[PDB]
Amino acid sequence: SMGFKVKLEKRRNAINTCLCIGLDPDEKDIENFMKNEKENNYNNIKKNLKEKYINNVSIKKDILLKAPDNIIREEKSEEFFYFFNHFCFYIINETNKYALTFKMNFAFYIPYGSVGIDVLKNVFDYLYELNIPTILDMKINDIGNTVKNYRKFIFEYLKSDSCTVNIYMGTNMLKDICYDEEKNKYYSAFVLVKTTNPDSAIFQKNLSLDNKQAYVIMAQEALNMSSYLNLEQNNEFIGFVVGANSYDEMNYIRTYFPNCYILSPGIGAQNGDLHKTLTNGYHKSYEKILINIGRAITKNPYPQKAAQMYYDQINAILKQNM
Amino acid sequence: GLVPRGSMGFKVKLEKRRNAINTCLCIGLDPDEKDIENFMKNEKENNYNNIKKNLKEKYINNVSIKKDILLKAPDNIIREEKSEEFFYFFNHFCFYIINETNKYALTFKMNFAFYIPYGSVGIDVLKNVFDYLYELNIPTILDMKINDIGNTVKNYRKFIFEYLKSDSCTVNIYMGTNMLKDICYDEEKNKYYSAFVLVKTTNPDSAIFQKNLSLDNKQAYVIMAQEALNMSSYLNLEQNNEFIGFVVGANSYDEMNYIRTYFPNCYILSPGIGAQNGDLHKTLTNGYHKSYEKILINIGRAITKNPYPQKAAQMYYDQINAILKQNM
Numbered sequence A: 001s002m003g004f005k006v007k008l009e010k011r012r013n014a015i016n017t018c019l020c021i022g023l024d025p026d027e028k029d030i031e032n033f034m035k036n037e038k039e040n041n042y043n044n045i046k047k048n049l050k051e052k053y054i055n056n057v058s059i060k061k062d063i064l065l066k067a068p069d070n071i072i073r074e075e076k077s078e079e080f081f082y083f084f085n086h087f088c089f090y091i092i093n094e095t096n097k098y099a100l101t102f103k104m105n106f107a108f109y110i111p112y113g114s115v116g117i118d119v120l121k122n123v124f125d126y127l128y129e130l131n132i133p134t135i136l137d138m139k140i141n142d143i144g145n146t147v148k149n150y151r152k153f154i155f156e157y158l159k160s161d162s163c164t165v166n167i168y169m170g171t172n173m174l175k176d177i178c179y180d181e182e183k184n185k186y187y188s189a190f191v192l193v194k195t196t197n198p199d200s201a202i203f204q205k206n207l208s209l210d211n212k213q214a215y216v217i218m219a220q221e222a223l224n225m226s227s228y229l230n231l232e233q234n235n236e237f238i239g240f241v242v243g244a245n246s247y248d249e250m251n252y253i254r255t256y257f258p259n260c261y262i263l264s265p266g267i268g269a270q271n272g273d274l275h276k277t278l279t280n281g282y283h284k285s286y287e288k289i290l291i292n293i294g295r296a297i298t299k300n301p302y303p304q305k306a307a308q309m310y311y312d313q314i315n316a317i318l319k320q321n322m
Numbered sequence B: 001g002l003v004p005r006g007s008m009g010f011k012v013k014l015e016k017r018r019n020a021i022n023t024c025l026c027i028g029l030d031p032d033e034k035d036i037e038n039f040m041k042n043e044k045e046n047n048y049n050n051i052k053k054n055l056k057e058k059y060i061n062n063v064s065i066k067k068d069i070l071l072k073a074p075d076n077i078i079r080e081e082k083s084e085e086f087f088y089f090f091n092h093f094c095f096y097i098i099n100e101t102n103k104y105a106l107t108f109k110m111n112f113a114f115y116i117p118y119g120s121v122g123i124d125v126l127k128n129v130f131d132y133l134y135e136l137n138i139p140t141i142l143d144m145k146i147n148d149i150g151n152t153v154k155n156y157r158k159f160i161f162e163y164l165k166s167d168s169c170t171v172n173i174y175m176g177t178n179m180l181k182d183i184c185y186d187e188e189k190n191k192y193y194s195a196f197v198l199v200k201t202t203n204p205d206s207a208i209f210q211k212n213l214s215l216d217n218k219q220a221y222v223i224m225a226q227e228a229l230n231m232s233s234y235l236n237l238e239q240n241n242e243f244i245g246f247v248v249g250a251n252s253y254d255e256m257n258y259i260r261t262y263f264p265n266c267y268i269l270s271p272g273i274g275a276q277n278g279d280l281h282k283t284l285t286n287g288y289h290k291s292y293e294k295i296l297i298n299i300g301r302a303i304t305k306n307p308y309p310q311k312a313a314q315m316y317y318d319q320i321n322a323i324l325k326q327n328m
């Protein structure tokens, strides 16, 4: 067990990027994949079937290994499962060489009931086999007794490396998310600090304590809690979600918490500025500034090339900042 | 003037149930791994008397997922459906609690966290639990404290309100109030839904942001409550028989009083009685409304971890009702 701090550093050394690929497939993405595959003689599924680690996923592997034409006539109930899982495998196979991390937003995997949670588990199994660091974006929050269920789901069942957390209820929830006292285990989390929605100022900026805006108070309390838990000693961390349209806050956070880990969504579909974001959030250890791109890759019909462009542009910008 | 189950807004469903059973008890259904294991053990030791009682209830035939398994004889499951054993006993535990306690419940609140830690299997259970409650016509809340950007949260709306057919859910609006437009309203179908936003919570350090943060001498919890109601008005929820309400912990007596004083007709959901030792008399006094569906008192573990959940629920029902009577 490396610990997520170490997993990130080592993969950064191998692939020299901070691109975080977001995998948030929606119903139209899955439908479109099925339709295109049905028309292009299942070219991408056939490619997926040749990859080594498809043989290691834990749920309904023998369904996933069946030929598509046979799924449709013999395992029709499993059609949606099969195409949803294969869409995810396809995106991962096409793009993983460019990704420091993958982030999966739980919301996209739940709305069909159990079936998408089987897909989600298989996606985490597949990434684990590929040794790619993972983030589950679920924005979890509850009282201690309740949130230990999320710890189990995220860190034991999915074996995620990290997750996102909303600490507005308080910053003691992290004791039951990032630490398992009975097992002496430690896990990493990114807490929400400044988000990308257009009205994010209403609580994050307009509330304050002793003339520091709420987002700074929350960031500091999160770090206070990380220190309490001794995460960084155990190769784990609490970091910050700072939107990639929030340049002032990104600048402020990187200046006043010089060595914090930042996860930054909002470039591509939400129109954030890549150059400004990466420059204001820059750190020499650039795994500390994860640039998440979801729909601009997954809704691109040429996702390998989409991911490659972001990888190449991030690397150009990192070079300028170095 | 009569309408079938499912064909009225939550506001009206709550009022109608409150006039039927005359309480504000909300029963929390948060089964943990120990609960499921202990139910399985006890049923195995007693020839499955509670499971056999669940199996005679009419509406068990109306749930969506794996009925072929749920309706099997329990010894059949153990000896020839080994891989379905956990699903079966988990689902039957939930059915058992609902069967034993529903006559006392104004609502049931299911916390999503308890249904996810085993992967997909608990989501099948959760879907059957919501289908069963829908058939019984008992008001539901999915406690999930959802929050995300608009495009992402529509997925939670679909899960909660289409897939589970929940009446309501809990929401954390720290990201912003805009997300309520994509939770409490579906612009494609023109459907409206109800939610309780987090206002003041029961965790011991809840003051760290909810009270410490402020805008011009109003504390965060007050500003969040007001913005949630501003959004409810904008969306016209109450005109469509839905609402945005507030989660205010049972142990937060001063904040409960403030909220009921400054928002006299708001809907409050109050967890923290029983396992978390909140003061029921103070909570109900401070949150009282003559339409007491506007002050839901959630009790989970103190009922579901009792070996006699029907009697534990009756006792809380009677205790609540005695306090309500003092207030009336």
Ligand SMILES: Nc1cc(=O)[nH]c(=O)n1[C@@H]1O[C@H](COP(=O)(O)O)[C@@H](O)[C@H]1O
Pocket: A022, A024, A105, A137, A164, A194, A195, A196, A197, A241, A243, A265, A266, A267, A268, A269, A270, A292, A293, A294, A295, A296, B148, B149, B152
């Ligand atoms: N967690 C987030 C906090 C945030 O402020 N903005 C945001 O978009 N997210 C999530 O990041 C991803 C943005 O993806 P995309 O806009 O690149 O598709 C989605 O999973 C969002 O729900």
Ligand SMILES: Nc1cc(=O)[nH]c(=O)n1[C@@H]1O[C@H](COP(=O)(O)O)[C@@H](O)[C@H]1O
Pocket: A142, A143, A146, B028, B030, B111, B143, B170, B200, B201, B202, B203, B247, B249, B271, B272, B273, B274, B275, B276, B298, B299, B300, B301, B302
């Ligand atoms: N949503 C909540 C907000 C809160 O402040 N406290 C709280 O306990 N809850 C939930 O209510 C229930 C409390 O149940 P119990 O303490 O009665 O078992 C659990 O589902 C908690 O996660």
